[PDB]
A and B are shown apart, each in its own frame.
With several copies, the nearest count.
Chain A
């Protein structure tokens, strides 16, 4: 998108355009681009038996090469030939960053470890008891001295530590593990229903994911979300942590800095360039792509 009108090899830009440019440069090919017909990335159109979309077109051998965010799944590669993966995507958890005022009536007595304040109250009682035992002077002067030193070192330390909290803002607050967003329930382990992450949390059998399936299916009308942008909304407003795809998680988590990642990839999958089943250019593009990832240009891109 720009001001002037153009088309074709100028009509697209971003990641996959640069990937296609470098791939046809080192491959020596003619990048005749075309957007998808049905628009969807597509799937095996299971009711109608066929594949739909980009899988249909490469299944129809119309285009030569499919260079996009397509994901090499074990149903999907039964009708095409995909390479080794361009990037390595996964399901991962997006939550709000530590917001800010996490106040409370503890924040007065926050910056000391609470056992010290408990023993401090104990020592106030004890020093007063020793003063009561002084009633059998230099005793009074020396207990005033030592007790004065004691509260001096406490109050000076507490000031220093409260200074260190108001200039070190290391929040690090929320739950950060897949099991962490599993086991608690004050967070809302939500997702985008009827898609990738819905499947790979649903169909799996890992235990942490099993409890995730429980907390998903319990509030299925409430906690499941419709669109990926709707998931961005539900993690913006409420405490609805979303479980979305890793590339979208990154491309939002360098967009609007209040949202943030939590934990690594739950599962893994391989997105990357694929072609019609039997295409001789496939392993050629594979050698190219592995050279590109060894080049650093893929990571650079």
Chain B
């Protein structure tokens, strides 16, 4: 029951209370492990570091021929201090960032997005009350809806659910529909608040003899809680990321048992 609709036939008070809200895909966590042990440094650096441990072994086995050895032990201590300090820095980077980002957003934040894609059911009431906007956030959202020309005005509502659940293309649907296709498939997420308002509801004819009595009974079912009961009835319904290291541990244990075989044989 909206403005130009109000003029012809007379609508009652509102049945439910609508809203224009964003249905987005839930963020699918992050990239998981395991073997996120060496994740913070570049792979070639870990390779050349293992080569450097071999180099230190070569330096000591050539020192098998003591202060001259003491100074190369000093350089080695300097080197592992810097490399494990830099390791803790980069892993601090990846965890502070991957906890730093606000995955959910506000409405103007959804306007400021890059990987998200706004849009409504193509050329309709959602496109209307985002079309004739005056709020500059919503205005710029209409600008981007007309601007990112590829597929922003997606056509169908089920296809709206398709563009939401498939790719990072958020739909901007009416809040009742966001309720139905949100609590019908729990992968979605209700981004934002309620960007507008409107009240859907029973509308009787042009000034007719039944706006009064019907709206009276509609409020009577609205405050004796039966409408909410009907609403709920027919509508409603780190860790192993570092795991790898334990695998390296077992692996080295097994390599050491092979070293044990070697030693017992030598005996």
A interface with B by C-beta (< 8 Å) = 72-74, 77-78, 81-82, 84-85, 87-88, 108, 112-113, 115-116, 119, 123, 126-127, 130, 133-134, 136-139, 142-143, 145-147, 149-150, 152-168, 170, 200, 203-206, 267-270, 283, 286-287, 290-291, 293-296, 299-300
Contacts and interface: CB of A to CB of B under 8 A. Distances in A.
A287 B224 contact: no
Contact of B92 (A78, A143, A163, A205): A163
B219 A77 contact: yes
Interface residues of B, number: 69
A167 B259 contact: no
Interface in B194-248: 196-199, 212, 215-216, 219-220, 222-225, 228-229, 232, 238-240, 242-243, 245-246, 248
Given A113-B239, A139-B256, 9 more contacts: A74-B224, A84-B13, A88-B197, A153-B245, A156-B91, A162-B89, A267-B228, A287-B7, A296-B135
Contacts of B239: 112-113, 115-116
Contacts of A127: 249, 253
Looking at chain A's contact residues, the main secondary structure is helix
Residue of A112, A137, A290 with most chain B CB atoms under a 10 A cut-off: A290
Interface stretch (B24-32, B80-88, B164-172, B180-188): B80-88
Q: Is the interface of B mostly helix, strand, loop or mixed?
A: helix
Most buried by B among A81, A155, A157: A157
Contacts of B82: 108
18 contacts: A81-B212, A116-B240, A130-B257, A134-B260, A136-B263, A138-B262, A139-B259, A142-B256, A143-B252, A152-B84, A155-B81, A156-B91, A160-B96, A161-B95, A164-B99, A166-B90, A167-B100, A170-B99
B219 A157 contact: no
B93 to A, nearest CB: 4
B244 to A, nearest CB: 9
Interface string B69-106: 00000000000011011111111111111011000000
Contacts of A145: 252
A161 B238 contact: yes
A92 to B, nearest CB: 13
B222 to A, nearest CB: 7
Contacts of B253: 126-127, 130, 143, 146
Contacts of A293: 196-198
A138 B10 contact: no
B255 interface: yes
B248 A156 contact: no
A287 B256 contact: no
B87 to A, nearest CB: 5
B134 interface: yes
A119 B246 contact: yes
Contact of A160 (B13, B91, B259): B91
Contacts of A154: 242, 245
A290 B238 contact: no
Contact of A123 (B17, B215, B246): B246
B85 A294 contact: no
